[PDB]
């Protein structure tokens, strides 16, 4: 079943947004505020931004056919991070920790 998978994706997303992982999840909770930061190049480099509050909306909206679609957007999020920042920056540190939460639980789907 497809939503049988999708409510397991939805459970992952609860976990990502949950407190336990907030120390490193917080910069993905909402989309990078390129305006407040002075990021004149952000939207030239990230053609398709993506963050967990977008993923939560698309989940509540029911825009997701399969769990591959879910996973595709979450990886997009992390890769935008890895693309925009240097490897030594603190966001990359965080984004890794979170992704490793995601990749693990995602791999335990039936």
Ligand X SMILES: Cc1cc(F)cc(C)c1Oc1ccc(C(C)(C)O)cc1-c1cn(C)c(=O)cc1NCC(=O)N[C@H]1CC[C@H](O)CC1
Write the Ramachandran bin of 52: left for phi over 0, alpha for psi from -120 to 50, otherwise beta. alpha
Q: Are 11 and 38 in contact (CB under 8 A)?
A: no
Q: Is residue 17 classed as helix, strand or coil in its secondary structure? A: helix
Task: Based on the shown chain and the rule CB under 6 A, indicate whether residue 37 belongs to the binding site for ligand X.
Answer: yes
Residue 22 has which token pair?
Answer: 């907030």
> In angstroms, rounded to a whole number, what is the distance separating the alpha carbons of residues 77 and 48?
9
* Closer CB to a second copy, 37 or 62, in the complex: 37
Residue 86 has which token pair?
Answer: 């240097």
* Closer CB to ligand X, 84 or 102, in the complex: 84
Task: Based on the shown chain and the rule CB under 6 A, indicate whether residue 103 belongs to the binding site for ligand X.
Answer: no
| Minimal distance, residue 38 CB to a second copy, in Å | 4
Q: Is residue 94 classed as helix, strand or coil in its secondary structure? A: helix
* Closer CB to ligand X, 66 or 90, in the complex: 90
Selection from ligand X, a second copy, none that 45 binds (CB < 5 to 8 A by kind) is none
Q: Which stretch binds ligand X (CB under 6 A): 27-35, 52-60, 64-72, 98-106?
A: 27-35
Task: Based on the shown chain and the rule CB under 6 A, indicate whether residue 49 belongs to the binding site for ligand X.
Answer: no
């Amino acid at each position: 079943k497809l939503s049988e998978q999708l409510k397991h994706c939805n459970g992952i997303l609860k976990e990502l947004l949950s407190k336990k992982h907030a120390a490193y999840a917080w910069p993905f909770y909402k989309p990078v505020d390129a305006s407040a930061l002075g990021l004149h190049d952000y939207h030239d480099i990230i053609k398709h931004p993506m963050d967990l509050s977008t993923v939560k909306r698309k989940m509540e909206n029911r825009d997701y056919r399969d769990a591959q679609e879910f996973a595709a957007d979450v990886r997009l999020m992390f890769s935008n991070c890895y693309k925009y920042n240097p490897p030594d920056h603190d966001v990359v540190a965080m984004a890794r920790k979170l992704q490793d939460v995601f990749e693990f639980r995602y791999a335990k789907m039936p």
